[PDB]
Design a protein around this ligand. Structure first.
Ligand SMILES: NC(=O)[C@H]1CCCN(C(=O)Cc2cccc3nsnc23)C1
Ligand SMILES: [Zn+2]
Length: 139
């Protein structure tokens, strides 16, 4: 679990969105596993606007932050689950590192700010849904 709070927005994994997230929907994309809902309270997370390929992510299954090199946002094949059939997930970045299903929502950050959130994993790899291209999160 986990979310990004920026201005009047809350960004979560789409497969983990609540009834309240859907009742206050701003934008959602199944192919990216992202959902953004509106919030009354003001968020103060800074989103990065960069092309970094190094950062630090939070791994709740180990209660630790890990430094990682990660790939550029791309279309990557993802196995079926109770949330999606087998498909390509776009805007996805991979790194060598530990993750478990409950790790989704953990933030990936670089020196510029929030890069994305954990969205997939397995076989010693962790996948992050990128948010740096969503320029509207700031306005
Ligand atoms: N975006 C998707 O389609 C997700 C939806 C939930 C299931 N999923 C996973 O990757 C499950 C998983 C297993 C093993 C380590 C994991 N670390 S994070 N998620 C992990 C795919
Ligand atoms: Zn950066």
């Amino acid at each position: 679990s986990g979310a990004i709070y920026v201005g009047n927005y809350r960004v979560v994994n789409r497969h983990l969105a609540t009834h309240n997230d859907w009742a206050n929907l701003v934008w959602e994309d199944s192919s990216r596993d992202l959902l953004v809902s509106s919030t009354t309270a003001q968020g103060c997370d800074t989103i990065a606007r960069c092309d970094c390929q190094t950062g630090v992510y939070y791994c709740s299954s180990r209660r630790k932050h890990y430094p990682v090199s990660f790939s550029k946002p791309s279309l990557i094949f993802v196995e079926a689950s109770e949330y999606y059939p087998a498909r390509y997930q776009s805007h996805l970045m991979l790194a060598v590192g530990h993750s478990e299903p409950g790790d989704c929502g953990g933030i990936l950050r670089c020196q510029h700010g929030v890069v994305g959130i954990v969205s997939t994993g397995g076989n010693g790899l962790v996948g992050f849904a990128d948010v740096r291209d969503l320029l509207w999160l700031d306005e």
